[PDB]
């Protein structure tokens, strides 16, 4: 069968050009009756069409960011490339390859999709997080960890004693905010010694904070 595979840097920074390329196997990119498209899907949002290109050089773009996209095709390596311009912190998403069928009487479905590549746009390279207590008001209380660069997160509650750590999302500033929380049966239990520790994976730096 025919299948696609993304290829490109998985992490970029603003004021740059996002460059990607999809290696096609099981079929020639010089074959007509098919367009080679790029679909964008931000984390938590729906799909977004970027543009497909015919082998004859006819490149159709999306009117939303037409002035900041560029698509090419290479019949030798069977790979079609994607090139954006002036990337922003909001351009991070999961990019999927897709081959549309232009065979019969109309354009039609993206028959074969790739595996999808997740890239992020951030100008920072190293930043240590900061912990903040959370006072309750059955109650809920926890810790607030914000502004950490690396993707992997290390959450530890009561040195292992258990939790729905609330996986963060890429905010407007290009960072993440962890808000892992726990539950208590009453406000009296909140007075007990509870600890929320996080570990900086690329730096092996541990952070401790007393919460109650």
């Amino acid at each position: 069968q025919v299948q696609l595979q993304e290829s490109g840097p998985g992490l970029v920074r603003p004021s740059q050009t996002l460059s990607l390329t999809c290696t096609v196997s099981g079929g020639s990119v010089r074959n007509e009756y098919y367009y080679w498209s790029w679909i964008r899907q931000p984390p938590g949002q729906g799909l977004e069409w970027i543009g497909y290109m015919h082998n004859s050089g006819n490149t159709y773009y999306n009117p939303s960011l037409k002035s900041r996209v560029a698509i090419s095709v290479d019949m030798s390596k069977n790979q079609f490339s994607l090139k954006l311009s002036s990337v922003t912190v909001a351009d991070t998403a999961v990019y999927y390859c897709a081959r549309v069928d232009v065979g019969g009487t109309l354009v039609s479905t993206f028959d074969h999709w790739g595996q999808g590549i997740l890239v992020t746009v951030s100008s920072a390279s190293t930043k240590g997080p900061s912990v903040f207590p959370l006072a309750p008001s059955t109650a809920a209380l926890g810790c607030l960890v914000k502004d950490y660069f690396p993707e992997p997160v290390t959450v530890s509650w009561n040195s292992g004693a258990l939790v729905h750590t609330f996986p963060a999302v890429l905010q407007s500033s290009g960072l993440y905010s962890l808000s892992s929380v726990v539950t208590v049966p009453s406000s009296s239990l909140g007075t007990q010694t509870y600890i929320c520790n996080v570990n900086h994976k690329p730096s092996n730096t541990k952070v401790d904070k007393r919460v109650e």
Binding site: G46, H164, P167, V181
Partner: protein, 213 residues
């Protein structure tokens, strides 16, 4: 610019039939093909209905597509739900200018466990958080099975749109979903404004809870 609008969340008990429909606003629905892509969370989308009436080989016959020219909409009939049918369905078509138009996305799920009313955990900024010149107002909503995670922010009198960083529906350790409604506000705005509201509106029930200093 041709667009497609579909419901945000659809839920129904197993062995029953659901209906996801996308309506074209700025153009016709019969001039271009409409396709439905079942995207399982964590994997690439996959075509289940193409050419508005055709289903690919291997896809179960439980799926069927329809076109309504009088209402300018395209529906998807799924009879006999199953456990693997809890994926998202995307309705995609094309504009007359050869522009691929994707739908808003619809989260479909089977009603395994009984639906429960969501919870609100409005938390004001902390002492050290206020010392850090930041607010970070969050709404760690929990205790809701259906994937109808919605967040509607509102200030004391005005609506709030900037700073919304609601995360994807995450499941707890007790097989139940919970989300977080992040919000970043200027401390001057938190000192000037009176209070804010975090409206959930899960499965129609507009659960609302406010927070004030």
């Amino acid at each position: 610019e041709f667009m497609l609008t579909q419901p945000h969340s659809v839920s129904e008990s197993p062995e029953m039939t659901v209906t996801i429909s996308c309506t074209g606003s700025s153009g016709s629905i019969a001039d271009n093909y409409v396709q439905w892509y079942q995207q399982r969370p964590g994997s690439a989308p996959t075509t289940v209905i193409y050419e508005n009436y055709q289903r690919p080989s291997g896809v179960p016959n439980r799926f069927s597509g329809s076109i309504d020219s009088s209402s300018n909409s395209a529906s998807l009939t799924i009879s006999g739900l199953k456990t693997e049918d809890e994926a998202d369905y995307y309705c995609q078509s094309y504009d007359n200018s050869n522009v691929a138009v994707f739908g808003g996305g619809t989260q479909l799920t089977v009603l395994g466990q009984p639906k429960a009313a969501p919870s609100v955990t409005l938390f004001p900024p902390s002492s050290e958080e206020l010392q850090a010149n930041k607010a970070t107002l969050v709404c760690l909503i929990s205790d809701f099975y259906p994937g109808a995670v919605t967040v509607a922010w509102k200030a004391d009198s005005s609506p709030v749109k900037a700073g919304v960083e609601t995360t994807t529906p995450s499941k707890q350790s007790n097989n139940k979903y919970a989300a977080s409604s992040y919000l970043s506000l200027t401390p001057e705005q938190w000192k000037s404004h009176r209070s804010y509201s975090c409206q959930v509106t899960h499965e129609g029930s507009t659960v609302e809870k406010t927070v004030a200093p």
